[PDB]
Design a protein around this motif. Structure first.
Motif, mmCIF file in Angstrom:
data_model
loop_
_atom_site.group_PDB
_atom_site.id
_atom_site.type_symbol
_atom_site.label_atom_id
_atom_site.label_comp_id
_atom_site.label_asym_id
_atom_site.label_seq_id
_atom_site.Cartn_x
_atom_site.Cartn_y
_atom_site.Cartn_z
ATOM 1 N N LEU A 5 5.768 -71.143 6.425
ATOM 2 C CA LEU A 5 5.209 -70.003 7.286
ATOM 3 C C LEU A 5 3.942 -70.382 8.228
ATOM 4 C CD1 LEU A 5 5.285 -67.692 4.087
ATOM 5 C CD2 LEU A 5 7.114 -67.844 6.001
ATOM 6 N N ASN A 6 3.535 -71.499 7.997
ATOM 7 C CA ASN A 6 2.236 -71.937 9.007
ATOM 8 C C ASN A 6 2.467 -73.235 9.366
ATOM 9 O OD1 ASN A 6 0.094 -72.462 10.366
ATOM 10 N ND2 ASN A 6 -1.255 -71.948 8.448
ATOM 11 N N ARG A 8 1.710 -74.973 11.558
ATOM 12 C CA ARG A 8 0.444 -75.655 12.190
ATOM 13 C C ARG A 8 -0.420 -76.271 11.043
ATOM 14 N NH1 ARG A 8 -3.266 -73.684 15.103
ATOM 15 N NH2 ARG A 8 -2.772 -74.870 16.991
ATOM 16 N N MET A 9 -0.368 -75.967 10.069
ATOM 17 C CA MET A 9 -1.259 -76.439 8.959
ATOM 18 C C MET A 9 -0.611 -77.847 8.118
ATOM 19 S SD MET A 9 -4.288 -75.732 6.806
ATOM 20 C CE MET A 9 -5.783 -75.367 7.802
ATOM 21 N N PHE A 12 -2.679 -81.096 8.609
ATOM 22 C CA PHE A 12 -3.937 -81.144 7.945
ATOM 23 C C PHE A 12 -3.631 -81.006 6.166
ATOM 24 C CE2 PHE A 12 -7.314 -78.328 5.773
ATOM 25 C CZ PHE A 12 -8.392 -79.226 5.718
ATOM 26 N N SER A 49 -6.678 -68.416 3.609
ATOM 27 C CA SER A 49 -7.384 -67.850 4.778
ATOM 28 C C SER A 49 -8.182 -69.094 5.405
ATOM 29 C CB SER A 49 -8.370 -66.679 4.557
ATOM 30 O OG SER A 49 -7.683 -65.639 3.810
ATOM 31 N N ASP A 50 -8.930 -69.585 4.486
ATOM 32 C CA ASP A 50 -9.866 -70.746 5.093
ATOM 33 C C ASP A 50 -9.332 -72.096 4.493
ATOM 34 O OD1 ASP A 50 -12.327 -72.704 4.349
ATOM 35 O OD2 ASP A 50 -12.832 -71.491 5.997
ATOM 36 N N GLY A 51 -8.775 -72.814 5.237
ATOM 37 C CA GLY A 51 -8.110 -74.231 4.631
ATOM 38 C C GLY A 51 -9.211 -74.978 4.117
ATOM 39 N N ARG A 52 -10.198 -75.198 4.714
ATOM 40 C CA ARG A 52 -11.330 -76.407 3.952
ATOM 41 C C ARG A 52 -11.792 -75.888 2.622
ATOM 42 N NH1 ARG A 52 -14.890 -74.377 8.654
ATOM 43 N NH2 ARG A 52 -13.552 -72.459 8.347
#
Lengths: 63, 116
Positions: A5-6, A8-9, A12, A49-52
């Motif tokens: 679904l994402n 772009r991630m 990473f 929400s926050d990947g890191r």
């Protein structure tokens, strides 16, 4: 696979939840297999929400 | 709700700018015959509201209207009939790299220099 679904991630997520398999954690590998923890880290980083921050959470959980 | 962060490219809740405000040119969206032909199709009222929103600031001169006019023309063309002859009154002459020829309904086939 929340990472679908994402898209772009994906880069990473793959390159980040890999220290679990890196030599840094080879000392623990025998103590605990990082298969469930690597899967959890990938599912977390590419789904929150926050990947890191979630990467921190997962890697710290395995530690 | 549809933000997609990626590695280094984090992000936060985008929020509307807190900036407030006579080029009434685009009023022709509901007046000129060329645009009037489209009235049975998509209504201009949303586009007139979009005018007003732009015009409020529309930083510049005779450009506050061209984006909305072009968008309305494209929407009508997609919905059906294509507005022929518009852009000859007040539009910003949609930019082109060179050989200025912005033309409604140019065939994509576009017989070129080296073609069979």
């Amino acid at each position: 696979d929340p990472c679908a679904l994402n898209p772009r991630m994906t880069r990473f997520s793959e390159e980040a939840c890999a220290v679990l398999t890196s030599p840094t954690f080879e000392a623990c590998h025998r103590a605990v297999s990082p298969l469930p923890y690597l899967r959890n880290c990938r599912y977390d980083v590419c789904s929150c929400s926050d990947g890191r921050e979630c990467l921190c959470g997962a890697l710290a959980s395995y530690a | 709700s549809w933000a997609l962060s990626s590695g280094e490219q984090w992000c936060e809740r985008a929020s509307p700018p807190s900036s407030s405000c006579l080029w009434e040119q685009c009023q022709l969206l509901k007046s000129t015959s060329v645009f009037a032909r489209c009235h049975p199709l998509v209504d201009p009222e949303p586009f007139v509201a979009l005018c007003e929103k732009t015009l409020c600031e529309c930083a510049g001169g005779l450009e506050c209207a061209c984006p909305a006019l072009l968008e309305y023309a494209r929407t009508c063309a997609q919905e059906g009939m294509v507005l022929y002859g518009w852009t000859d009154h007040s539009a910003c002459s949609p930019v082109c790299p060179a050989g200025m020829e912005y033309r409604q309904c140019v065939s994509p086939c576009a017989r070129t220099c080296q073609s069979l």
